[PDB]
Amino acid sequence: EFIIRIPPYHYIHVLDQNSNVSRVEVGPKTYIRQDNERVLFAPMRM
Amino acid sequence: VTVPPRHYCTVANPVSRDAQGLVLFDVTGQVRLRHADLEIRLAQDPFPLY
């Protein structure tokens, strides 16, 4: 759950629960979430 | 795959290439493509599918 590597040409949204702010991350990169931050859904193609 | 003479094939998302036809690579090591495009390939050596 904590480790989320999105495939190339994709994105995910992770919510900063300490700020109620959502963001999107792009690029073929491996991503690790924080304890407070929660991803909303699994990667889907951009 | 190879295409014989007097034949052709189409592959979606063609390879993005430089002035010398060398395959350009992304910073993260990915292959540079051309999204939502089609290319016509005529007879040549057996190219690989990226």
- Picking from A33, A27, A22, A31, the residue whose alpha carbon sits closest to that of residue A46 is A27
**How distant is the Cα of A13 from the closest Cα of chain B, in angstroms?**
21
This entry's atomic model was obtained through cryo-EM
Residue A39 has which token pair? 């991803």
The three-class DSSP label of residue B50 is coil
CA A46 from centroid of its chain's CA atoms: 13
A5 at B interface, C-beta within 8 A: no
The contacts of residue B30 (CB under 8 Å, 6+ apart) are A8, A28
CA A27 from centroid of its chain's CA atoms: 11
A26 at B interface, C-beta within 8 A: no
Half-sphere exposure in the Cβ direction for A42 (13 Å, CA): 1
Within 10-49 of B, beta carbons closer than 8 Å to A belong to 26, 28-30, 35
Q: What residues in B contact A10, CB-CB < 8 Å?
A: none
How far, in Å, CA of B40 to CA of B50, rounded? 16
Residue type, B18: D
How far, in Å, CA of A38 to CA of A45, rounded? 19
Q: What Å distances lie between residue B10 and A30, B1, B2, B37, B40, CA to CA? A: 32, 12, 12, 10, 5
